[PDB]
Amino acid sequence: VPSTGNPFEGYDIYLSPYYAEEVEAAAAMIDDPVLKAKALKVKEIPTFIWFDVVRKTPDLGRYLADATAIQQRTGRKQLVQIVVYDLPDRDCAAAASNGEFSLADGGMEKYKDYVDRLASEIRKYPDVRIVAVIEPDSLANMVTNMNVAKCRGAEAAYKEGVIYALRQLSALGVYSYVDAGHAGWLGWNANLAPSARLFAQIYKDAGRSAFIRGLATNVSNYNALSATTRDPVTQGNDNYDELRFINALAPLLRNEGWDAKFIVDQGRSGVQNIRQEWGNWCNVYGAGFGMRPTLNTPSSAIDAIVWIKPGGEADGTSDTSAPRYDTHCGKSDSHKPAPEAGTWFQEYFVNLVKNANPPLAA
């Protein structure tokens, strides 16, 4: 059964051991003592843990067991942050996708099985709280990318999969935030109303559980939360940062029947004005770690600022010959050479540390 208020309030946020391992290994490669110590600070900053392949589902059991042990030893309630990211025909508007499930090869049923595997892990550990981001780069495509044949082909599956995930996770008391793009995607004035209609419909069809807490924005992106001067890349869009986007969208959601709350990724938002084109997302060069996760947010509608994408993990390879190569990863403002998506990108992590804003302390 749901509890009232902000679901993050009063919880210690479980620190990803996956990311801590990566950061420890990264700092070991850094020669300057001060920079090494700053890098090590990063493992103390909570991130979301991604379930982007079904092989990772048993790792959820391990993290929940670990959070349970910490809670038992210390008496401090733990909250585990996860990402559900494995829809069939994933990333339908992208030049390439790493998603393992295809609609043509039983992808819808395989997706339901993936959700069931996550649910079976969660069922083992009921004493810890979970916040889940549901399916980055999915339903936002239905708002703006229906010109893409793969997106029209994926619409039914995206809606079905997201609704199945929300119903399954809400049954287990997980607090979900559905991915809702970012200011440069859904924040354009023309996209606000169809976004509000679509997300309110998903909330309805998922059964209006209060565990469906709201929407997640800026996932794996680089937008400011609130910029004093707009990024030149945002020209033409009045809603040029995430707070502007959310302030424009939230009232329309409410009119459409859902008083949604929000979380906002700021993990790679420390440096603004680093893009040639707003749609450039892959390993954007010179990004810095951004605002630290906090419940001190600029609006009652925003539950938390979070780090969803774990900075340092690559967005995609720059090898043009690689099977899953995405042309976005070869843009002039992308950091190259870059390794496979999700794998450690040392040079990129070093720049995230150097460029952190606010700066990292040793």
TrEMBL record:
Disulfide bonds join 92-151, 282-329. Mg(2+) binds at residue 236. The keyword S-adenosyl-L-methionine does not apply. Residues 325-338 have a biased composition (Basic and acidic residues). Residues 313-338 are annotated as: Disordered. It is an enzyme of class 3 (hydrolase). Substrate binds at residues 50, 52, 182, 185, 221, 281, 309, 313. Its EC number is 3.2.1.-. It comes from the Eukaryota. GO terms for cellular component: extracellular region. The active site is at 91, 137 (proton donor), 315 (proton acceptor). One of its GO terms (molecular function) is hydrolase activity, hydrolyzing O-glycosyl compounds. Keywords: Carbohydrate metabolism, Cellulose degradation, Disulfide bond, Glycosidase, Hydrolase, Metal-binding, Polysaccharide degradation, Signal. GO terms for biological process: cellulose catabolic process. Belongs to the glycosyl hydrolase family 6. This is Glucanase. It comes from Coprinopsis cinerea. The lineage of its organism: Eukaryota, Fungi, Dikarya, Basidiomycota, Agaricomycotina. The gene is CcCel6A. The chain holds residues 95 to 454 of 454 of the full protein.
